[PDB]
Structure 1
Amino acid sequence: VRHIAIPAHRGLITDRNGEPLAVSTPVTTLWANPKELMTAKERWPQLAAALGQDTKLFADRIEQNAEREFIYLVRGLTPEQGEGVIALKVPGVYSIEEFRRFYPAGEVVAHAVGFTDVDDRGREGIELAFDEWLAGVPGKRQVLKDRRGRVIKDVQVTKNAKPGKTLALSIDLRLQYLAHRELRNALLENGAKAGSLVIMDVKTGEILAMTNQPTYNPNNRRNLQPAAMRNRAMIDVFEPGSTVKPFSMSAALASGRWKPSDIVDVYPGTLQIGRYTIRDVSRNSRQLDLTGILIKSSNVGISKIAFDIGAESIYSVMQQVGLGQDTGLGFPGERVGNLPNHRKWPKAETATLAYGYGLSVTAIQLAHAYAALANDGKSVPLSMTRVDRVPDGVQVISPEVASTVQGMLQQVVEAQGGVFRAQVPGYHAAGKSGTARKVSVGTKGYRENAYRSLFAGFAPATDPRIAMVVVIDEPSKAGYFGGLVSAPVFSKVMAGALRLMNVPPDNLP
């Protein structure tokens, strides 16, 4: 006598509130004993029709396997259409109860959640990451044959399978939906080719939403683009441009060489460093103060400061806030990125670092860096499961240096000539826009037709609760600046995010 393994019930995956994101539904599998089927050949065409198979090819198969002990007829029928075949009473055919995954939210959380293969085994996303947790231990039942090789059902020897454990994600489904809508809208409005949006609780390190475009339906995956399956927020890296200037500025303030009211001469909006040149886009002034360097996004201005304080001070801050650093999440295919070191930093590499080039980070890392800045310089570890206690973070930027930079970032949103489209009705919002040329397809240089539109920020400025990053690849029909393309998305999603968490408005009306 032999065994057939009976599969375990895979553990439920939910959002932070209990909304189901991946549930295992019962499905029927039918197998047969050819030694018995060959005695009821008259019933084969009826059976084959009930299985939706060709009557001849079905017969061909049962014939070739006549001497065999055990064969599958079909895997993964519904419980209704499955027991339809059982009701035909055909001798030699039996049922097994199996499980198949279903994803209620579909493409909205597909990238995060991932999916299981045909055998209900985790293969992408959280399904793969927490596969041990979610799987459980399968059982088994013994099949009992008699004197003539017929199997009997009246008696059953069974070891019950142990069901998998429930997993509550950090993601808020209500907030994911909102984030997914707006990123899709922005991507279609601007004719963009890809995008990512990350929402994080700055206090708990929880990822409240993480969505990407293009996406896919994990319930129907026939013919699928590899590009559509990428969780770009964790799997793809980019040079973050001027969105890392507040960290350069943090290093400046902490060095004791600079104060907010210092002025810097940025004339004529260019700075030649040997065989290469630094350029300011808005060459509208000769002199800017520190806040003005962020507002007008002066690459020349921040470069001069970097020469004064040195790259070592800048590199440390960026490293402490998590840029180019392991997140500790353990997501499948997740990228650490690259924050380089040189022993002795030349001026060119010192400058480009100061305004966010030469380093590569993920959206989740950028959002994590802004969360520390938002949480009074107190970096807290990332989590994609529901957090039951506010964890021990690390004070990476000084509480005072943080408040200053918080104030400065609030100005780039609210001050004149600032990123006014990032403003949130009823809330004081802080953040920084960015526009960056994409790196050349396998060459030293950069593209000049392809841009990445960035906006990173947090709100409310009076007591930051959540931080957000928006990234849009290759906008192509309605401008391309970050404060034009990414900022409106930030504004839209942040507005909804805050009210959904019942955050009190601090900027009336």
Structure 2
Amino acid sequence: RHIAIPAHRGLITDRNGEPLAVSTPVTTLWANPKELMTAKERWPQLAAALGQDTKLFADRIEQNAEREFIYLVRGLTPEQGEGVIALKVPGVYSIEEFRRFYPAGEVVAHAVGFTDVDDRGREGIELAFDEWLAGVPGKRQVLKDRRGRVIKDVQVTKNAKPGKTLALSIDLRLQYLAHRELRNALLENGAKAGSLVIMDVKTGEILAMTNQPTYNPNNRRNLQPAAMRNRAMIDVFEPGSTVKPFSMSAALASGRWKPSDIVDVYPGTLQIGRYTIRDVSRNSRQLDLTGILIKSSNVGISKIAFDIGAESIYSVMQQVGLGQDTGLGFPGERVGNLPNHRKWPKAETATLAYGYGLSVTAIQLAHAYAALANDGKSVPLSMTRVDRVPDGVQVISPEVASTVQGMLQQVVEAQGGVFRAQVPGYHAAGKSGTARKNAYRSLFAGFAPATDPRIAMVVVIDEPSKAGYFGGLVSAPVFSKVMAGALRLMNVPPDN
């Protein structure tokens, strides 16, 4: 005797108010079979107007002849819905429902996400903020006889309360650029998949989060599972060489190391019992601390790790958020793993230092680079617009963080460095990685402007299927292109 009035779901906008998910009116048709059974001559026209087969439709009504309510179709356009009401079939009733429209479609599919057949969040923000966005359904009183004829909508028991508007931290302008450049990078490199995250180092905001493959959330048929994966938050991977800046932060905080110190890495290998630590380039002897990062020496970083101890390194990585809960509350978001010991064996000490054996998400890696860029201060991650910035936690000392920033600027700008990550007009800083899963993931993590950091970025390219696979070759030019555009879109003054 009482029906549910569906509430208008809260609008999702980007940080500048551009619409990202909009509640659109749709017409749901239901029928009182007992009443339909008195107008059988009308069924074929009704069947056609609903997009059902004549006999299948008549089979469906006959079976439910005793029932007082059945749905005919859900989510017709109010125009298609009018056409059925125009038929004037006895026992046919309509309910005004809501279906989401995603104006930017595939461009921000994984971050915004989508709703199910019931207008409930299923993925991404739609799911995470489902309670805020859903509002509360209405309740009304109706007069119905024995044949089930809806005589009159007597009174409203409770009025439907709409959902609340939500402004994301995402900047659709930076999102379009990140989407486009990641898509082009995947095609050029013949890659299986990719992720790209942009963060505001000062506010903790995620300014862009894109993955490949993507999907159109407006095309509700086919939807391929693999295409719907929000890899940036769900795919865990070994960060490899991109963790070396954190091992270096612990070295500089220990009091035992300064940038001009030297480590002898010759012959480019180091035996630790059954295990052998190996460098890619094996034509070095003495390297200073910056040289260890430029050359990306697994041996160099392992030797520093043995001197300072793995506890100091684990602590920096844990404090920056590697293998830690982001607090974003996205159901199914992976936390990964950061290994821990009471007594760190030599092999585990070395592997921790060069990012082997730990598992992280592109979001955690981006958040960690944000803390280092933000002069050692970690500001809580946010997927919504931050108007009042929360207090950050000083995780790395400002002096150490500033020293590490300078070394990462030399990684990008020095002789033998990652020249493809250079951002024309600006001083950029970062570190490449290559993680053997022969199948690899190409990685680049960095920030800019090196002199006053504003944005951190992580580019992850999964299984590049061309001549070059190293992070410095495959992901570094994507960071370059996306950073050059993002800094200019944010009117960041060039610092070079």
Q: Structure 1: how far apart are the matches of 2:101 and 2:202? A: 33
* Residue 285, structure 1, aligned to residue 274, structure 2: no
SS at match of 2:461: strand
Q: Structure 1: how far apart are the matches of 2:52 and 2:280? A: 67
Residues 1:57 and 1:377: Cα distance change in structure 2 (over 3 Å)? same
SS at match of 2:144: coil
Give how far 1:157 is off. Answer: 4.4
Contact 2:445 2:457 in 1 (8 A): yes
Question: 1:361-404 CA distances to partner (integer Å, 9 max, x unpaired)?
Answer: 11111111111110111111100011011220011111111111
Aligned position for 1:125: 124
Q: Structure 2: how far apart are the matches of 1:302 and 1:147? A: 82
Q: Structure 2: how far apart are the matches of 1:179 and 1:154? A: 51
Q: Structure 2: how far apart are the matches of 1:271 and 1:420? A: 28
Question: 1:78-121 CA distances to partner (integer Å, 9 max, x unpaired)?
Answer: 00110111122222212110111121111221111211111111
Q: Structure 2: how far apart are the matches of 1:75 and 1:405? A: 58
Give how far 1:271 is off. Answer: 0.9
SS at match of 1:155: strand
Give TM-score scaled by structure 2 length: 0.97
Give how far 1:205 is off. Answer: 0.3
Q: Structure 2: how far apart are the matches of 1:107 and 1:464? A: 30
Give how far 1:353 is off. Answer: 1.1
Over the matched positions of the two proteins, sequence identity in percent amounts to 100
Give how far 1:495 is off. Answer: 0.6
Give how far 1:422 is off. Answer: 0.3
Question: 1:260-308 CA distances to partner (integer Å, 9 max, x unpaired)?
Answer: 1111111111111111111111123211111111001111111111111
SS at match of 2:444: strand
Residues 1:214 and 1:204: Cα distance change in structure 2 (over 3 Å)? same
Residues 1:448 and 1:63: Cα distance change in structure 2 (over 3 Å)? closer
SS at match of 1:259: coil
Q: 2:488 aligns with which of 487, 492, 499?
A: 499
360-369 vs 58-67, which moves further: 58-67
Aligned position for 1:427: 426
SS at match of 2:75: strand
Contact 2:141 2:153 in 1 (8 A): no
Residues 1:205 and 1:147: Cα distance change in structure 2 (over 3 Å)? closer
Question: 1:449-490 CA distances to partner (integer Å, 9 max, x unpaired)?
Answer: 111111000000111000000111111113101000000000
454-463 vs 31-40, which moves further: 31-40
Contact 2:140 2:153 in 1 (8 A): no
Residues 1:187 and 1:145: Cα distance change in structure 2 (over 3 Å)? same
Contact 2:212 2:227 in 1 (8 A): yes
Residues 1:300 and 1:82: Cα distance change in structure 2 (over 3 Å)? same
SS at match of 1:209: strand
Contact 2:32 2:148 in 1 (8 A): no
How many residue pairs are counted as aligned between the two chains? Answer: 496
Q: 1:452 aligns with which of 423, 441, 452?
A: 441
Gaps of 5+ in 1: 437-446
Give how far 1:340 is off. Answer: 1.4
SS at match of 1:244: helix
SS at match of 2:207: strand
Residues 1:49 and 1:131: Cα distance change in structure 2 (over 3 Å)? same
Residues 1:299 and 1:51: Cα distance change in structure 2 (over 3 Å)? same
Give how far 1:234 is off. Answer: 1.0
Question: 1:128-153 CA distances to partner (integer Å, 9 max, x unpaired)?
Answer: 11111111111122221358753324
Question: 1:15-71 CA distances to partner (integer Å, 9 max, x unpaired)?
Answer: 111111111110001112233333333222222222222223323333333333222
Give how far 1:158 is off. Answer: 5.7
SS at match of 1:153: strand
Contact 2:442 2:470 in 1 (8 A): yes
Q: Structure 1: how far apart are the matches of 2:352 and 2:417? A: 23
Q: How does 1:203-214 map to 2 (within 5 A)?
A: 203-214=202-213
Residues 1:93 and 1:417: Cα distance change in structure 2 (over 3 Å)? same
Q: Structure 2: how far apart are the matches of 1:149 and 1:11? A: 34
Contact 2:49 2:84 in 1 (8 A): yes
Give TM-score scaled by structure 1 length: 0.94
Residues 1:315 and 1:434: Cα distance change in structure 2 (over 3 Å)? same
Q: Structure 1: how far apart are the matches of 2:337 and 2:394? A: 22
Contact 2:7 2:137 in 1 (8 A): yes
Contact 2:142 2:153 in 1 (8 A): no
SS at match of 2:437: strand
Residues 1:55 and 1:36: Cα distance change in structure 2 (over 3 Å)? same
Q: Structure 1: how far apart are the matches of 2:338 and 2:186? A: 29
Give how far 1:344 is off. Answer: 1.1
Gaps of 5+ in 2: none
Question: 1:390-419 CA distances to partner (integer Å, 9 max, x unpaired)?
Answer: 220011111111111100000010011100
325-334 vs 51-60, which moves further: 51-60
Q: Structure 1: how far apart are the matches of 2:221 and 2:346? A: 52
Give how far 1:154 is off. Answer: 7.4
Give how far 1:232 is off. Answer: 1.0
SS at match of 1:31: strand
Residues 1:149 and 1:302: Cα distance change in structure 2 (over 3 Å)? closer
SS at match of 2:283: coil
Residues 1:338 and 1:448: Cα distance change in structure 2 (over 3 Å)? closer
Q: Structure 2: how far apart are the matches of 1:342 and 1:150? A: 71
SS at match of 2:381: coil
Contact 2:141 2:154 in 1 (8 A): no
Question: 1:336-355 CA distances to partner (integer Å, 9 max, x unpaired)?
Answer: 11111111111111111111
Residues 1:226 and 1:49: Cα distance change in structure 2 (over 3 Å)? closer
Residues 1:126 and 1:448: Cα distance change in structure 2 (over 3 Å)? closer
Q: Structure 2: how far apart are the matches of 1:157 and 1:355? A: 65
RMSD value over aligned CA atoms?
1.6
Q: Structure 2: how far apart are the matches of 1:143 and 1:56? A: 32
SS at match of 2:486: helix
Give how far 1:227 is off. Answer: 1.9
Q: Structure 2: how far apart are the matches of 1:294 and 1:215? A: 34
Give how far 1:236 is off. Answer: 1.2
110-119 vs 57-66, which moves further: 57-66
Q: Structure 2: how far apart are the matches of 1:129 and 1:147? A: 44
Q: Structure 2: how far apart are the matches of 1:494 and 1:253? A: 28
Residues 1:94 and 1:378: Cα distance change in structure 2 (over 3 Å)? same
SS at match of 1:156: strand
Q: Structure 2: how far apart are the matches of 1:358 and 1:448? A: 11
